[PDB]
Amino acid sequence: ELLDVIKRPVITEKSMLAMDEKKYTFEVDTRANKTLVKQAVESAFDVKVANVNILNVRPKFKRMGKYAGYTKKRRKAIVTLTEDSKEIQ
Amino acid sequence: MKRTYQPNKRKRQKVHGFRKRMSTKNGRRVLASRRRKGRKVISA
Amino acid sequence: AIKKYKPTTNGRRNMTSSDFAEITTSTPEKSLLQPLKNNAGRNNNGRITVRHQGGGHKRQYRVIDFKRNKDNVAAVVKTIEYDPNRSANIALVHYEDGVKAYILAPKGLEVGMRLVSGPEADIKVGNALPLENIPVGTVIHNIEMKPGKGGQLIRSAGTSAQVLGKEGKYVLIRLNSGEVRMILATCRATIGSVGNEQHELINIGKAGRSRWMRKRPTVRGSVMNPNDHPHGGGEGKTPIGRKAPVSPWGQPAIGYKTRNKKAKSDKLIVRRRTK
RNA sequence: GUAUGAGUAGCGAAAGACAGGUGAGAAUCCUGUCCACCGUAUGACUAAGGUUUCCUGGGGAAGGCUCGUCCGCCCAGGGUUAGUCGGGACCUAAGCCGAGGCCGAUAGGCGUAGGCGAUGGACAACAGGUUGAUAUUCCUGUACCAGUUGUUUUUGUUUGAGCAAUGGAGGGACGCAGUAGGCUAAGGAAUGCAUGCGAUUGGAAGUGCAUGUCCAAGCAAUGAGUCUUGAGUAGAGUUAAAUGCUUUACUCUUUAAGGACAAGUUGUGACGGGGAGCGAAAUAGUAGCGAAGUUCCUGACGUCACACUGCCAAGAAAAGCUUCUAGUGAGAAAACAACUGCCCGUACCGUAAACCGACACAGGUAGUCGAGGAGAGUAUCCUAAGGUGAGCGAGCGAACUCUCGUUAAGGAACUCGGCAAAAUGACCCCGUAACUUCGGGAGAAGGGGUGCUGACUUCGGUCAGCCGCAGUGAAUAGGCCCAAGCGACUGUUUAUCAAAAACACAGGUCUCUGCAAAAUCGUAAGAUGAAGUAUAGGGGCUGACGCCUGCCCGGUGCUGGA
């Protein structure tokens, strides 16, 4: 299962900035340590070290028809490189 | 002056909790009664 | 002796307190302390059993020696002290082997003495003999009950007990409070009466001081409401209407005896006189 | 569901005005100017608690005590980065769970070993910059902890290598009160800096206005100062050992020497950063560029530090740590270089419109910082940094109710009762009765002075002069005396109609109880009394202190009797 840690990349006004210092942002599935994501990226993209960062998120609400329901959790992943690029987006 | 329902997080889970209601022979009566009525939140 | 504070403010009028004019140091031994708690009169159930307890300063327990079994090694006293638990001071002793422990303070002990506690010591203050080889007429203390248990009889300040006479079995004794009995001849004891002798002559003076020692106020009886104490009720100041003044559960208080009529000691008691 | 009361009562303390925007529409939104309010807080940071209220762009159906282009509201997008910070992968207190186990109609009760449990212990990062929102987390620079690899320096696992116990120890390790000393912070007043010179009479200034007046952790050096006597000898002991530790007996040693500790200071860190202002090319005061770092005075219960002296009410535990041996048991130290470091919290409000009170409520909310002038001061009056102008208004200036100000002559005639108001109130000086438990009454009573200028000031103050009706000129700031009852006093009491003469209280006295003590909770095991032992522990009445405390045992209890 060391390929379904990373889920997809975050594309935001903020994230787009970090693209200008070799810093990328993915959604990592919950229950994954840092080192796991290190391994996953290195083994999926031919890139390197410069320790990752990680987060957590709360849910929110929504009101459609008297229907109050939350949304999923999250876990961002903000990765830093040393020498190579990702011309993948 | 001071009114009653001064809320906390530890106490409300170490009095009306779950494990503190699965630790007796009476808490289980309470739980099963809350399950028979068809309740959502069995115990806070 | 006893100080007599000069009357400055009413809650200081006629207080009294010791001098502490023999206590040498003010720093206990480290390896003799043990912690404690202030039960405030409460069971494992968590209820009052005895009223009027709890709520004062802190105390840390001092493990006094009570059996006095090390024999044929001289014991040297070095310092007296103060103790918060009992009502009598305490001495620290060094044995030649390099071990420490405490002793109660007999009335007349001083630093620099040397003590022995064998079955063939000499009879001078401080020594701890077996009850047999203590001659007639002396005044001894820390008396045991069951051989090997330690001391449990006379233990507090300013108290005496003569030895009236031996038998083949057992030894007689005139206890304090003037009542005779007999205890097995193979019990340990030390000689001489206990120490601070005026500790009864202290007029406390304030109410916050008897509250420093862990006491607590104790309402009269005849004030409470009838549903809470048999004396109470009655509109006005009332006399005890019921005969035989009572405690809050029965048991008249004045005149009533309370031994256990089938006790296992009446064979060993001669002339209960003062109770 | 809809009426009456009725278009009535209310719109929940505090100051706004104008100009121009914006827009279908404006007192109520934005911008500008002047004004005004708080400022030991209406200011800054945090712990709970709340749970997306935070930010960006749209909207005006409902909430907003009116209005509303606006909002803590509706719609859409987006924000919370850690080896070092708080917690876990460390230790334990109260308390709880408790393998076996001891009791009990069932249910179950209680408890050993072992554990769980921060409000406590112990432990490796600092300064500046960066955004619309995050910052000991991102970035820059300088560090630190513990480990892993690679070339870089001593071999009988005996242990002369090294390592090193679940054992032997040392340590961690602890109260309150009172002043005294040493530093830094903070504060104040004159030097250095850059700038401009008043349109109201006047004024290029040693002595004139406005304005700024500096910087880490770590590393290296030192150090106001604080604590402590130290050595040998023959012994015991430390369940086996000990070169570690306790201890005895003796001989020398004492302002000494040795050891232990220490706020701080100087350089470096630093060509870095910050800074009054100056300041573009445009959507920008933005990008960018910048002075100087002085002397003297007052100076912390912040720090050395529970350091010292005194007192009695006699003042947590365990791990981390240092050692020693028993000990399995090649050859690990240190070069330098380069790497590895897990999970959880991080938005926002937080004396409040976001918490507790049904509310956008005149109530409640633990901790740190908390400036200037006078001033003992966190008091009072006005103010700095900083924040606010409170969610209905425009008029008129009647009765009446509430909150305030003033009064002729009289001064308790009112009244159940001087309730309420009025009167005194600061600092310095003179002086002060009966009575007494000799400490007190005592701030008893009753009186006098205070402003400004000059001279002399021995030092404090004294002289001379000037003005007002009034000189602590405003705010803050005891009314007193003569007798009686009750209660000795400081305390405590009916949350929400009674705060006393009620209870407590120190002292008095009777009585019980010899330790598996009496007594109490429980059917019992088990507990408290107590790790106490008659100078102790429970029960009943009385309530400082002084002088005292008479008569009756026939009746009712209690104890003794045979």
mmCIF file of all heavy atoms in Angstrom, chain D residues 94 142 161 180 269 301 327 329 397 399 436 454 466 540 552:
data_model
loop_
_atom_site.group_PDB
_atom_site.id
_atom_site.type_symbol
_atom_site.label_atom_id
_atom_site.label_comp_id
_atom_site.label_asym_id
_atom_site.label_seq_id
_atom_site.Cartn_x
_atom_site.Cartn_y
_atom_site.Cartn_z
ATOM 1 P P A D 94 -1.162 9.111 48.117
ATOM 2 O OP1 A D 94 -1.048 8.375 49.394
ATOM 3 O OP2 A D 94 -1.132 8.379 46.832
ATOM 4 O "O5'" A D 94 -2.511 9.944 48.165
ATOM 5 C "C5'" A D 94 -2.926 10.571 49.362
ATOM 6 C "C4'" A D 94 -3.999 11.572 49.078
ATOM 7 O "O4'" A D 94 -3.550 12.438 48.021
ATOM 8 C "C3'" A D 94 -5.289 10.990 48.559
ATOM 9 O "O3'" A D 94 -6.136 10.584 49.610
ATOM 10 C "C2'" A D 94 -5.873 12.127 47.748
ATOM 11 O "O2'" A D 94 -6.520 13.042 48.610
ATOM 12 C "C1'" A D 94 -4.626 12.803 47.204
ATOM 13 N N9 A D 94 -4.296 12.426 45.827
ATOM 14 C C8 A D 94 -3.166 11.770 45.472
ATOM 15 N N7 A D 94 -3.044 11.571 44.190
ATOM 16 C C5 A D 94 -4.171 12.156 43.667
ATOM 17 C C6 A D 94 -4.615 12.269 42.359
ATOM 18 N N6 A D 94 -3.943 11.771 41.325
ATOM 19 N N1 A D 94 -5.774 12.894 42.139
ATOM 20 C C2 A D 94 -6.426 13.374 43.188
ATOM 21 N N3 A D 94 -6.101 13.328 44.471
ATOM 22 C C4 A D 94 -4.949 12.689 44.654
ATOM 23 P P U D 142 26.331 31.737 9.711
ATOM 24 O OP1 U D 142 27.747 32.085 9.456
ATOM 25 O OP2 U D 142 25.731 30.541 9.080
ATOM 26 O "O5'" U D 142 26.166 31.610 11.283
ATOM 27 C "C5'" U D 142 26.933 32.415 12.155
ATOM 28 C "C4'" U D 142 26.431 32.326 13.570
ATOM 29 O "O4'" U D 142 25.021 32.626 13.603
ATOM 30 C "C3'" U D 142 26.522 30.967 14.226
ATOM 31 O "O3'" U D 142 27.813 30.701 14.722
ATOM 32 C "C2'" U D 142 25.475 31.062 15.321
ATOM 33 O "O2'" U D 142 25.992 31.801 16.412
ATOM 34 C "C1'" U D 142 24.407 31.915 14.649
ATOM 35 N N1 U D 142 23.270 31.138 14.112
ATOM 36 C C2 U D 142 22.199 31.019 14.948
ATOM 37 O O2 U D 142 22.216 31.497 16.055
ATOM 38 N N3 U D 142 21.123 30.326 14.472
ATOM 39 C C4 U D 142 21.029 29.761 13.231
ATOM 40 O O4 U D 142 20.000 29.165 12.928
ATOM 41 C C5 U D 142 22.177 29.931 12.405
ATOM 42 C C6 U D 142 23.235 30.599 12.863
ATOM 43 P P A D 161 42.207 -0.965 33.503
ATOM 44 O OP1 A D 161 41.679 0.354 33.929
ATOM 45 O OP2 A D 161 41.349 -2.177 33.522
ATOM 46 O "O5'" A D 161 42.732 -0.833 32.006
ATOM 47 C "C5'" A D 161 42.300 -1.745 31.007
ATOM 48 C "C4'" A D 161 42.061 -1.053 29.690
ATOM 49 O "O4'" A D 161 42.114 -2.029 28.611
ATOM 50 C "C3'" A D 161 40.701 -0.393 29.518
ATOM 51 O "O3'" A D 161 40.600 0.881 30.124
ATOM 52 C "C2'" A D 161 40.548 -0.378 28.009
ATOM 53 O "O2'" A D 161 41.404 0.595 27.434
ATOM 54 C "C1'" A D 161 41.098 -1.756 27.671
ATOM 55 N N9 A D 161 40.053 -2.761 27.879
ATOM 56 C C8 A D 161 40.057 -3.768 28.798
ATOM 57 N N7 A D 161 38.970 -4.491 28.786
ATOM 58 C C5 A D 161 38.205 -3.902 27.800
ATOM 59 C C6 A D 161 36.938 -4.196 27.304
ATOM 60 N N6 A D 161 36.172 -5.193 27.728
ATOM 61 N N1 A D 161 36.463 -3.417 26.324
ATOM 62 C C2 A D 161 37.221 -2.411 25.890
ATOM 63 N N3 A D 161 38.429 -2.032 26.270
ATOM 64 C C4 A D 161 38.859 -2.832 27.240
ATOM 65 P P A D 180 15.252 47.844 55.651
ATOM 66 O OP1 A D 180 15.538 49.280 55.816
ATOM 67 O OP2 A D 180 14.477 47.399 54.480
ATOM 68 O "O5'" A D 180 16.622 47.034 55.660
ATOM 69 C "C5'" A D 180 17.660 47.409 56.547
ATOM 70 C "C4'" A D 180 18.950 46.653 56.319
ATOM 71 O "O4'" A D 180 18.760 45.231 56.507
ATOM 72 C "C3'" A D 180 19.590 46.740 54.947
ATOM 73 O "O3'" A D 180 20.241 47.970 54.696
ATOM 74 C "C2'" A D 180 20.544 45.556 54.976
ATOM 75 O "O2'" A D 180 21.690 45.867 55.751
ATOM 76 C "C1'" A D 180 19.719 44.527 55.744
ATOM 77 N N9 A D 180 19.042 43.585 54.840
ATOM 78 C C8 A D 180 17.711 43.371 54.629
ATOM 79 N N7 A D 180 17.458 42.444 53.743
ATOM 80 C C5 A D 180 18.709 42.029 53.348
ATOM 81 C C6 A D 180 19.136 41.071 52.432
ATOM 82 N N6 A D 180 18.316 40.318 51.709
ATOM 83 N N1 A D 180 20.456 40.898 52.271
ATOM 84 C C2 A D 180 21.286 41.644 52.992
ATOM 85 N N3 A D 180 21.004 42.579 53.883
ATOM 86 C C4 A D 180 19.685 42.718 54.014
ATOM 87 P P G D 269 32.325 39.225 15.416
ATOM 88 O OP1 G D 269 32.921 38.816 14.124
ATOM 89 O OP2 G D 269 32.032 40.650 15.690
ATOM 90 O "O5'" G D 269 30.974 38.411 15.599
ATOM 91 C "C5'" G D 269 30.932 37.018 15.344
ATOM 92 C "C4'" G D 269 29.730 36.379 15.985
ATOM 93 O "O4'" G D 269 29.759 36.607 17.412
ATOM 94 C "C3'" G D 269 28.390 36.922 15.542
ATOM 95 O "O3'" G D 269 27.974 36.313 14.337
ATOM 96 C "C2'" G D 269 27.495 36.590 16.724
ATOM 97 O "O2'" G D 269 27.096 35.234 16.670
ATOM 98 C "C1'" G D 269 28.456 36.766 17.901
ATOM 99 N N9 G D 269 28.343 38.106 18.486
ATOM 100 C C8 G D 269 28.875 39.247 17.980
ATOM 101 N N7 G D 269 28.581 40.299 18.683
ATOM 102 C C5 G D 269 27.819 39.815 19.718
ATOM 103 C C6 G D 269 27.230 40.498 20.791
ATOM 104 O O6 G D 269 27.264 41.701 21.045
ATOM 105 N N1 G D 269 26.535 39.639 21.608
ATOM 106 C C2 G D 269 26.434 38.297 21.406
ATOM 107 N N2 G D 269 25.716 37.623 22.311
ATOM 108 N N3 G D 269 26.983 37.645 20.406
ATOM 109 C C4 G D 269 27.657 38.467 19.605
ATOM 110 P P C D 301 13.046 44.654 46.616
ATOM 111 O OP1 C D 301 12.917 45.166 47.994
ATOM 112 O OP2 C D 301 14.381 44.252 46.127
ATOM 113 O "O5'" C D 301 12.062 43.412 46.452
ATOM 114 C "C5'" C D 301 12.119 42.578 45.295
ATOM 115 C "C4'" C D 301 11.116 41.448 45.345
ATOM 116 O "O4'" C D 301 11.139 40.861 46.670
ATOM 117 C "C3'" C D 301 9.668 41.852 45.096
ATOM 118 O "O3'" C D 301 8.903 40.772 44.558
ATOM 119 C "C2'" C D 301 9.163 42.088 46.504
ATOM 120 O "O2'" C D 301 7.763 42.012 46.637
ATOM 121 C "C1'" C D 301 9.856 40.959 47.248
ATOM 122 N N1 C D 301 10.012 41.218 48.680
ATOM 123 C C2 C D 301 10.179 40.147 49.543
ATOM 124 O O2 C D 301 10.219 39.005 49.073
ATOM 125 N N3 C D 301 10.315 40.390 50.860
ATOM 126 C C4 C D 301 10.270 41.638 51.315
ATOM 127 N N4 C D 301 10.402 41.844 52.624
ATOM 128 C C5 C D 301 10.088 42.747 50.455
ATOM 129 C C6 C D 301 9.959 42.489 49.156
ATOM 130 P P G D 327 31.546 -11.868 40.331
ATOM 131 O OP1 G D 327 32.329 -13.089 40.626
ATOM 132 O OP2 G D 327 32.200 -10.726 39.652
ATOM 133 O "O5'" G D 327 30.294 -12.262 39.444
ATOM 134 C "C5'" G D 327 30.357 -12.137 38.041
ATOM 135 C "C4'" G D 327 29.254 -11.260 37.519
ATOM 136 O "O4'" G D 327 29.265 -9.984 38.215
ATOM 137 C "C3'" G D 327 29.370 -10.873 36.056
ATOM 138 O "O3'" G D 327 28.966 -11.894 35.160
ATOM 139 C "C2'" G D 327 28.547 -9.598 36.000
ATOM 140 O "O2'" G D 327 27.165 -9.892 36.078
ATOM 141 C "C1'" G D 327 28.973 -8.942 37.307
ATOM 142 N N9 G D 327 30.211 -8.181 37.103
ATOM 143 C C8 G D 327 31.426 -8.438 37.681
ATOM 144 N N7 G D 327 32.361 -7.620 37.294
ATOM 145 C C5 G D 327 31.718 -6.782 36.400
ATOM 146 C C6 G D 327 32.223 -5.692 35.662
ATOM 147 O O6 G D 327 33.370 -5.238 35.649
ATOM 148 N N1 G D 327 31.243 -5.108 34.876
ATOM 149 C C2 G D 327 29.940 -5.515 34.817
ATOM 150 N N2 G D 327 29.157 -4.824 33.982
ATOM 151 N N3 G D 327 29.452 -6.536 35.493
ATOM 152 C C4 G D 327 30.392 -7.114 36.263
ATOM 153 P P G D 329 30.510 -14.449 28.577
ATOM 154 O OP1 G D 329 30.541 -15.879 28.177
ATOM 155 O OP2 G D 329 31.592 -13.906 29.431
ATOM 156 O "O5'" G D 329 30.444 -13.605 27.228
ATOM 157 C "C5'" G D 329 31.544 -12.814 26.806
ATOM 158 C "C4'" G D 329 31.233 -11.351 26.961
ATOM 159 O "O4'" G D 329 30.555 -11.143 28.227
ATOM 160 C "C3'" G D 329 32.425 -10.415 27.029
ATOM 161 O "O3'" G D 329 32.979 -10.097 25.760
ATOM 162 C "C2'" G D 329 31.848 -9.219 27.777
ATOM 163 O "O2'" G D 329 31.025 -8.442 26.920
ATOM 164 C "C1'" G D 329 30.950 -9.913 28.791
ATOM 165 N N9 G D 329 31.632 -10.189 30.072
ATOM 166 C C8 G D 329 31.656 -11.405 30.691
ATOM 167 N N7 G D 329 32.310 -11.424 31.811
ATOM 168 C C5 G D 329 32.762 -10.128 31.953
ATOM 169 C C6 G D 329 33.528 -9.554 32.993
ATOM 170 O O6 G D 329 33.986 -10.069 34.013
ATOM 171 N N1 G D 329 33.756 -8.222 32.761
ATOM 172 C C2 G D 329 33.306 -7.547 31.674
ATOM 173 N N2 G D 329 33.641 -6.267 31.661
ATOM 174 N N3 G D 329 32.589 -8.049 30.696
ATOM 175 C C4 G D 329 32.349 -9.349 30.894
ATOM 176 P P G D 397 -40.031 76.596 24.861
ATOM 177 O OP1 G D 397 -41.092 77.552 25.241
ATOM 178 O OP2 G D 397 -38.697 77.068 24.438
ATOM 179 O "O5'" G D 397 -39.832 75.623 26.099
ATOM 180 C "C5'" G D 397 -40.856 75.490 27.073
ATOM 181 C "C4'" G D 397 -40.409 74.664 28.244
ATOM 182 O "O4'" G D 397 -39.596 73.577 27.747
ATOM 183 C "C3'" G D 397 -39.547 75.404 29.256
ATOM 184 O "O3'" G D 397 -39.741 74.829 30.546
ATOM 185 C "C2'" G D 397 -38.142 75.097 28.769
ATOM 186 O "O2'" G D 397 -37.149 75.206 29.761
ATOM 187 C "C1'" G D 397 -38.299 73.662 28.291
ATOM 188 N N9 G D 397 -37.369 73.278 27.241
ATOM 189 C C8 G D 397 -37.311 73.822 25.997
ATOM 190 N N7 G D 397 -36.397 73.273 25.253
ATOM 191 C C5 G D 397 -35.836 72.299 26.055
ATOM 192 C C6 G D 397 -34.804 71.381 25.781
ATOM 193 O O6 G D 397 -34.160 71.241 24.743
ATOM 194 N N1 G D 397 -34.537 70.571 26.860
ATOM 195 C C2 G D 397 -35.194 70.646 28.044
ATOM 196 N N2 G D 397 -34.799 69.780 28.974
ATOM 197 N N3 G D 397 -36.163 71.490 28.318
ATOM 198 C C4 G D 397 -36.431 72.286 27.281
ATOM 199 P P A D 399 -43.464 72.111 35.929
ATOM 200 O OP1 A D 399 -43.060 72.932 37.080
ATOM 201 O OP2 A D 399 -42.487 71.176 35.352
ATOM 202 O "O5'" A D 399 -44.751 71.302 36.369
ATOM 203 C "C5'" A D 399 -45.781 71.962 37.075
ATOM 204 C "C4'" A D 399 -46.992 71.092 37.266
ATOM 205 O "O4'" A D 399 -47.327 70.426 36.031
ATOM 206 C "C3'" A D 399 -46.873 69.959 38.262
ATOM 207 O "O3'" A D 399 -46.996 70.391 39.603
ATOM 208 C "C2'" A D 399 -47.997 69.037 37.826
ATOM 209 O "O2'" A D 399 -49.237 69.533 38.283
ATOM 210 C "C1'" A D 399 -47.962 69.203 36.311
ATOM 211 N N9 A D 399 -47.203 68.133 35.669
ATOM 212 C C8 A D 399 -46.116 68.273 34.872
ATOM 213 N N7 A D 399 -45.637 67.134 34.452
ATOM 214 C C5 A D 399 -46.479 66.195 34.999
ATOM 215 C C6 A D 399 -46.512 64.810 34.919
ATOM 216 N N6 A D 399 -45.635 64.101 34.228
ATOM 217 N N1 A D 399 -47.475 64.157 35.569
ATOM 218 C C2 A D 399 -48.354 64.873 36.254
ATOM 219 N N3 A D 399 -48.426 66.184 36.412
ATOM 220 C C4 A D 399 -47.450 66.796 35.746
ATOM 221 P P U D 436 -10.585 51.490 88.965
ATOM 222 O OP1 U D 436 -11.378 50.429 89.603
ATOM 223 O OP2 U D 436 -9.629 52.264 89.776
ATOM 224 O "O5'" U D 436 -9.769 50.812 87.784
ATOM 225 C "C5'" U D 436 -10.314 49.735 87.043
ATOM 226 C "C4'" U D 436 -9.251 49.044 86.233
ATOM 227 O "O4'" U D 436 -8.712 49.967 85.262
ATOM 228 C "C3'" U D 436 -8.039 48.564 87.012
ATOM 229 O "O3'" U D 436 -8.248 47.292 87.597
ATOM 230 C "C2'" U D 436 -6.938 48.558 85.968
ATOM 231 O "O2'" U D 436 -6.997 47.370 85.203
ATOM 232 C "C1'" U D 436 -7.339 49.727 85.076
ATOM 233 N N1 U D 436 -6.598 50.966 85.384
ATOM 234 C C2 U D 436 -5.289 51.081 84.980
ATOM 235 O O2 U D 436 -4.684 50.202 84.403
ATOM 236 N N3 U D 436 -4.692 52.264 85.291
ATOM 237 C C4 U D 436 -5.267 53.318 85.941
ATOM 238 O O4 U D 436 -4.608 54.324 86.149
ATOM 239 C C5 U D 436 -6.613 53.123 86.324
ATOM 240 C C6 U D 436 -7.222 51.988 86.025
ATOM 241 P P G D 454 12.943 84.445 44.318
ATOM 242 O OP1 G D 454 13.713 84.464 43.056
ATOM 243 O OP2 G D 454 12.612 83.168 44.986
ATOM 244 O "O5'" G D 454 13.738 85.359 45.344
ATOM 245 C "C5'" G D 454 14.247 86.613 44.932
ATOM 246 C "C4'" G D 454 14.716 87.434 46.101
ATOM 247 O "O4'" G D 454 13.634 87.642 47.031
ATOM 248 C "C3'" G D 454 15.812 86.821 46.942
ATOM 249 O "O3'" G D 454 17.080 87.036 46.363
ATOM 250 C "C2'" G D 454 15.649 87.526 48.279
ATOM 251 O "O2'" G D 454 16.296 88.784 48.242
ATOM 252 C "C1'" G D 454 14.146 87.778 48.333
ATOM 253 N N9 G D 454 13.413 86.873 49.232
ATOM 254 C C8 G D 454 12.517 85.944 48.800
ATOM 255 N N7 G D 454 11.954 85.283 49.761
ATOM 256 C C5 G D 454 12.505 85.817 50.906
ATOM 257 C C6 G D 454 12.261 85.475 52.247
ATOM 258 O O6 G D 454 11.488 84.618 52.673
ATOM 259 N N1 G D 454 13.005 86.238 53.117
ATOM 260 C C2 G D 454 13.882 87.209 52.739
ATOM 261 N N2 G D 454 14.516 87.832 53.732
ATOM 262 N N3 G D 454 14.123 87.542 51.483
ATOM 263 C C4 G D 454 13.403 86.809 50.612
ATOM 264 P P C D 466 5.014 95.036 52.020
ATOM 265 O OP1 C D 466 4.673 96.395 51.561
ATOM 266 O OP2 C D 466 4.458 94.545 53.295
ATOM 267 O "O5'" C D 466 4.577 94.042 50.862
ATOM 268 C "C5'" C D 466 4.930 94.298 49.512
ATOM 269 C "C4'" C D 466 4.263 93.322 48.579
ATOM 270 O "O4'" C D 466 4.832 92.003 48.755
ATOM 271 C "C3'" C D 466 2.786 93.116 48.817
ATOM 272 O "O3'" C D 466 2.002 94.129 48.229
ATOM 273 C "C2'" C D 466 2.546 91.749 48.214
ATOM 274 O "O2'" C D 466 2.511 91.861 46.803
ATOM 275 C "C1'" C D 466 3.833 91.026 48.591
ATOM 276 N N1 C D 466 3.727 90.239 49.844
ATOM 277 C C2 C D 466 3.150 88.965 49.858
ATOM 278 O O2 C D 466 2.694 88.501 48.813
ATOM 279 N N3 C D 466 3.084 88.263 51.012
ATOM 280 C C4 C D 466 3.581 88.784 52.130
ATOM 281 N N4 C D 466 3.512 88.075 53.257
ATOM 282 C C5 C D 466 4.183 90.063 52.151
ATOM 283 C C6 C D 466 4.233 90.741 51.001
ATOM 284 P P G D 540 -22.033 15.026 73.663
ATOM 285 O OP1 G D 540 -23.353 15.021 73.006
ATOM 286 O OP2 G D 540 -20.953 15.858 73.107
ATOM 287 O "O5'" G D 540 -22.310 15.432 75.171
ATOM 288 C "C5'" G D 540 -23.550 15.091 75.753
ATOM 289 C "C4'" G D 540 -23.664 15.489 77.202
ATOM 290 O "O4'" G D 540 -22.572 14.970 77.979
ATOM 291 C "C3'" G D 540 -23.644 16.961 77.522
ATOM 292 O "O3'" G D 540 -24.868 17.592 77.200
ATOM 293 C "C2'" G D 540 -23.336 16.958 79.014
ATOM 294 O "O2'" G D 540 -24.504 16.699 79.769
ATOM 295 C "C1'" G D 540 -22.426 15.743 79.142
ATOM 296 N N9 G D 540 -21.014 16.094 79.325
ATOM 297 C C8 G D 540 -19.985 15.892 78.462
ATOM 298 N N7 G D 540 -18.841 16.293 78.930
ATOM 299 C C5 G D 540 -19.141 16.783 80.180
ATOM 300 C C6 G D 540 -18.306 17.349 81.160
ATOM 301 O O6 G D 540 -17.089 17.540 81.114
ATOM 302 N N1 G D 540 -19.014 17.711 82.288
ATOM 303 C C2 G D 540 -20.354 17.541 82.435
ATOM 304 N N2 G D 540 -20.871 17.951 83.590
ATOM 305 N N3 G D 540 -21.144 17.015 81.532
ATOM 306 C C4 G D 540 -20.474 16.661 80.436
ATOM 307 P P C D 552 -27.816 18.967 104.248
ATOM 308 O OP1 C D 552 -27.803 18.209 105.510
ATOM 309 O OP2 C D 552 -26.644 18.878 103.352
ATOM 310 O "O5'" C D 552 -29.132 18.526 103.477
ATOM 311 C "C5'" C D 552 -30.335 18.314 104.192
ATOM 312 C "C4'" C D 552 -31.418 17.738 103.316
ATOM 313 O "O4'" C D 552 -31.743 18.665 102.260
ATOM 314 C "C3'" C D 552 -31.101 16.448 102.582
ATOM 315 O "O3'" C D 552 -31.231 15.305 103.407
ATOM 316 C "C2'" C D 552 -32.113 16.466 101.451
ATOM 317 O "O2'" C D 552 -33.375 16.042 101.931
ATOM 318 C "C1'" C D 552 -32.197 17.957 101.131
ATOM 319 N N1 C D 552 -31.366 18.325 99.972
ATOM 320 C C2 C D 552 -31.920 18.231 98.704
ATOM 321 O O2 C D 552 -33.086 17.852 98.593
ATOM 322 N N3 C D 552 -31.183 18.553 97.631
ATOM 323 C C4 C D 552 -29.933 18.951 97.813
ATOM 324 N N4 C D 552 -29.219 19.263 96.736
ATOM 325 C C5 C D 552 -29.344 19.050 99.095
ATOM 326 C C6 C D 552 -30.089 18.730 100.145
#
